């Protein structure tokens, strides 16, 4: 159960940035993914096969999102995680694009589009997060 | 364990087609996928969310490849099957593109590129055949 929509949809993001700042700080791909609900090409993401210990953060606002301990590589075209660093970090939206229903995931502080979540992950959580590398930055442990 | 290479690599395909014939018959996308080892964009394939009972065949030569009973949908960008219709239908090749090791799958009869096989699949096989929709045709039951 969840109220559907990003904090941009709900008009209540805690963190905001000017477009001038966003355009000069983000690459065009990072901007398109996080600001226009884009998806990075499969197998081209910088963090798809990254295994270093550390924390993945929102590329836009720097809020921590995922711990390296929860990352796994099984052959998906994009980074995959078992769990979010804490329940407050991500917001959910019902997504009906491409002729299917998915649950889209966004940063709860600035509203950046991140990826999608699926209900078929192993225990304990039962979840699997498919996340665009272009939506993340990485801080080594 | 397998000898690596398509029947084109091994110079022993049972069936061959003229390249003018193939161009007339296949769309540019089907040609690029099957003849140039291409990959279709995620979520755009005709059979990605297809559920009708029947049999999927090689789009080039017509050989049966997959039964609808083995198809599953876990949210992948491409059609997913857990087993091939018979052990002789598909040939395997070690593939090192995109900074990865994958096992590429091709039609044993004509050498057409189909997709890849992974070890992250469900029981009973543990295998996921990740197959481009553009490499397939479908015959309803
Ligand atoms: Cl893609
Ligand atoms: Zn953010
Ligand atoms: Zn064939």
Author numbering:
A (entry chain B), B (entry chain A): -3 to 137
Question: What did the paper state?
Answer:
MsrB1 has an active-site selenocysteine and is found in the nucleus and cytosol. Both MsrB2 and MsrB3 contain active-site cysteines, but MsrB2 is present in mitochondria, and MsrB3, the focus of this article, has distinct splice variants targeted to mitochondria (MsrB3B isoform) or the endoplasmic reticulum (ER) (MsrB3A isoform, hereafter referred to as MsrB3). As anticipated, the MsrB3 structure has the characteristic Mss4-like fold found for other MsrB proteins, consisting of two highly twisted, short-stranded β sheets. The cysteines Cys3 and Cys9, in the CX5C motif, were found to be disulfide bonded to one another adjacent to the zinc-coordinating site and far (∼21 Å) from the active-site cysteine, Cys126.
A truncated version of MsrB3 was then produced, spanning residues 1–137 of the mature protein. Truncated MsrB3 also contained additional electron density in the active site. In this case, the species appeared to be covalently bound to the active-site cysteine. Based on previous observations that crystallization in the presence of cacodylate buffer can result in modified cysteine residues, together with inspection of simulated annealing composite omit maps, the density was modeled as a dimethylarsinoyl modification, in which the arsenic is bonded to the cysteine sulfur by displacement of one of the oxygen atoms of the cacodylate. A comparison of the active-site regions of the two crystal forms shows good superposition of all the functional groups that are in hydrogen bonding distance of the sulfenic acid or bound water molecule. Only the region around Ser70, which forms hydrogen bonds to Ser72 and Ser76 but is 4.0 Å away from the sulfenic acid, is altered in the dimethylarsinoyl-modified form due to a local and minor change in loop structure with a maximum backbone displacement of 2.7 Å.
